[PDB]
Amino acid sequence: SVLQVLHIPDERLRKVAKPVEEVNAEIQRIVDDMFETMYAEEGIGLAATQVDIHQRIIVIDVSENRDERLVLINPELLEKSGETGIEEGCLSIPEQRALVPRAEKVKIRALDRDGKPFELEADGLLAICIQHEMDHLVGKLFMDYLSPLKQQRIRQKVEKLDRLK
Ligand SMILES: [Co+2]
Question: Could you tell me the domains of the chain?
Fold first, then answer.
C-alpha cells in the first residue's frame, strides 16, 4: 500500500524514532509499504518518520534499474570520511533542492528485512542518501544545514505548493 508522506512544516517530521524491537511480520509489512511508497513518489530513499511511523526503518534504492532494495533497520554509523555535497531533494520538501555538506564515505551496520545484521561501506550517491535518511530518523531535515533565511523561503514555497493542491 502507498502511504501518505508528510510535508514540512509538520512537527511529526521532527520526532526521534525509537529502535525497532524485533524484525517480525509487521515490520516486514512496513518495509514493503515503504518501498511501494518510495517508488510511487519517484524517490530513492524513505525513512519511516516521513510516513508517520516513528521507528528506525529506512528503505533505499539508488540503482539505475530500480531493482536493488536496501533496508536499514536500526542503523548505526561506524566510520565516515571526507566531505562532499550535491543538491539534495526530499519527498517531505517537495520540489525544493539545495546543496548540503555530507561525508563522502560512510560505513554503517544495520539489520536487513530478515532481521540479519550486516555492514555496508558506501561512497558517492549511496553514502549521501544513507546520511539523509539517517538524519530523518532523528528529526533532522536537509534544510537544517541551510541559513535561517533559506529555511524560511523553502518552507514558504512548500506551503504555497500544497495550498494550490
Ligand atoms: Co528526505
Answer: 1-165 (3.90.45.10)
